[PDB]
Amino acid sequence: TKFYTDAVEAVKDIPNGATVLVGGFGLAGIPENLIGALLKTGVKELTAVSNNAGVDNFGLGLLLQSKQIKRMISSYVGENAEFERQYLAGELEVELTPQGTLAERIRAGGAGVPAFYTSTGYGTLVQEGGSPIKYNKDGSIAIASKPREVREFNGQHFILEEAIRGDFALVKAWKADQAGNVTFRKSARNFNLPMCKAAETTVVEVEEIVDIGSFAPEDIHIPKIYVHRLVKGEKYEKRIERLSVRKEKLGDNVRERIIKRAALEFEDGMYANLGIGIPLLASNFISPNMTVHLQSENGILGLGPYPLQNEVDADLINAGKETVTVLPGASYFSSDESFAMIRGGHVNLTMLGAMQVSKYGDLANWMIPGKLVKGMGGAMDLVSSAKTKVVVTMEHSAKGNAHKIMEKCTLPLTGKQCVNRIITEKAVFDVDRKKGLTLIELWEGLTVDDIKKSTGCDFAVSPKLIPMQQVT
Amino acid sequence: TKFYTDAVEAVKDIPNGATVLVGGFGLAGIPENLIGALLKTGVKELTAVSNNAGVDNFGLGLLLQSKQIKRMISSYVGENAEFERQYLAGELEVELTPQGTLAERIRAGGAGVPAFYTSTGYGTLVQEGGSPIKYNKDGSIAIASKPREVREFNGQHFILEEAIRGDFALVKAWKADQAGNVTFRKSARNFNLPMCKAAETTVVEVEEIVDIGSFAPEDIHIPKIYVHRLVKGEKYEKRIERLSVRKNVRERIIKRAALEFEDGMYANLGIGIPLLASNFISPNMTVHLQSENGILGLGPYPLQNEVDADLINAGKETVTVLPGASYFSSDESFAMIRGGHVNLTMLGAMQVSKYGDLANWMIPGKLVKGMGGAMDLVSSAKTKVVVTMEHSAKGNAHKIMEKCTLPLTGKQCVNRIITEKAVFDVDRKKGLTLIELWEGLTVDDIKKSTGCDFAVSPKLIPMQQVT
Questions:
Q1: Residue in A116, A219, A347 closest to B117 by CB
Q2: B47 DSSP β-pair partners
Q3: φ and ψ at A265, to 5 degrees?
Q4: Catalytic residue of the set B82, B128, B205, B292
Q5: Which of B107, B116, B186 to mutate: most A Cβ within 10 Å?
Q6: What distance in Å separates the CA atoms of residue B423 and residue B415, rounded to the nearest whole number?
Q7: Which domains, from first to last, does chain B contain?
């Protein structure tokens, strides 16, 4: 490990056109001093591999404003006007990559694995190709993603994904000892850890340089062997994107009914990953005596309530980028380990919203051609495992009684045959492996006929059809 | 996480024929209570996925004695007489698997990755097939391994390896908090960590149970989500295989070998000559030694009071670490070695070819114990591979030749050969170059002790020796 005092000196040799991995999830764990260093060198045409694109004036966004990025490889790019303008203007190439796939590919890149198979993205634009990478001035697509190879294993379909290696990796860590060993604080770890292993030259900026012995040899997140260049951050703003505090939620009729039904999916000792909104709100009605373990794909197991003014930490945020807290017994881990857990099917329940759900469990909730193209985030991984139960919480129909439940989705798919249950303010549907969409619950006062005209496809009706339940 | 008081109650439902992952590297990190419980259940015809086969009277050796295993998937099965008899008599099936590949396949199994590529084993029996899985009572091979799929990626060839998943995983850990979060001690982690994520039902035995809050959330080696069944070990022997403590031909090789070390270099040395050379490294020089069982920062052998059964090197010798050292799982270790992060791999060999082929793990009909991590150590193109060996074998038979006659460990992977007579630079396309020669010797002396031709560096110098 070579130590530097000046950050510019640590990245003055990054070549124009270089692939650079940039740690960070939202504004948590971003190497701001190294980013500031690139602003100064004026290096350009970079291919930035980063989960997100920061915001307009922080993180990657700063390199977007200075036009130093030619191509981005990320999972979610919302909340960044500069990114949106460049991407839609044809000034920025972007490869929307499932967060978990992105993490494992970086991981493979550092582990000498040129390629591996995954089910994430199977049955979507990731596998089929066609995802917009570059737009023309008029709005048409100039560059689309190419299809992936599909291979069968044990009766299931997987696609071939290639490792990601960088010439450089700009990493943000918490502490580094005088030997070069590195550790990360809370959820600020995310992609920084795997990124330290997949680049020819890894440059790490820490908030503190510590003495050798500050860490137990068993608790070193990144061994020195991976840290090529190290520099102590000169300054840290640690901006908070979404300040969420609780002073120590039902809303309207439709949302309230969905929340109260969704709350009954939770089971004692269950490991769950909940999308922001209804699912997360439903966790608020979980019995005080029931133990549910919430997982955050950004690397957290044991999520807690929103912090009080004094518990607000920029290094601790949920997948929705909100400042949160963790409960005693919680654990943190990298983005790649996080998706290994999700892809491997160790999470019992995944509950999220959706724009469309098909008769046999297809899900569509990440893109609307020509209207909404911000990436899939970790939504494709969250629904990729067969061992995980997937529940969708959503209005039964859209405005004008526009169907959201249909035979097949008209919107780009997040996942194929992955939804196990659907909960709307009007009904609850199970998607059994043989019959498909099956009405098991119906809101009081409504008839099967009311459901038929609100639903886009025909469905089986359970002989045990009960009035829709509501958390007591 | 369900907590159990009796190890047998936690494994009583393991089916006959089940695939069971057994943590442990040598005798370090082995689930002895879960293994003892398997003796009481009497479950059999198990396919045991374990790096080694322990010894005759400890670890998997116990399950071999009780004849409860039909097939072993391991990287190194030496030092076990029971295993030797069964394997050779055709009673036991054995899949000799490279350690790093074994670790990545297990990790893939827990991460939803069904298959992946690795260059480890390319050009060897692993890729080609023919590795002896089962023998006949007449000495011939009953079951040989099948060829792996080869595929090119950026100018280099890799082989397809499928994920390994178990029905059950028998894991040994150190501490678990009351929430089900587990931690591992030193080099006892090894395979225990990845195996805890690749089985339908993982059973973990720990030495202590601590309160929630005793671990820092960022330092939990295995989060509760992976621990299905947990039991506090009822008894722990923690046997030590080899107690290593401290207070000319070979000397020549060792002294030249020490000059391969550079300041700030990361290297992995095999037991014997390579490791012996580290003793001649300058104190003003910093060389970071890595061990494949999960250690970076190896120190000298321990004093009597430093001996720890949880801290051994790849040669299964008790060791110590230096400040700044780190521990990590076996998959992490081989990701490190496979990714080419280690700058130098120095090891022994029985044969090296003209173009860099290495043969150091199997002698047909005479010795078959597994390749261990040797195939992974020479698998990266970013890593400098140096072989240290006597120039000739018994009867003056060549050890350096046109083509290896012994099964290969790696193809075109040796960069330099150090014998007691000469130093050779090796190029995968042009061959051997004599760059150093032992004083008193002539190029002719080397020509008649070498199985192939070689170029002679115009800068040929007398063979160096560390002072």
A1: A116
A2: B19, B71
A3: -80, -30
A4: B292
A5: B116
A6: 11
A7: 1-233 (3.40.1080.10), 248-461 (3.40.1080.10)
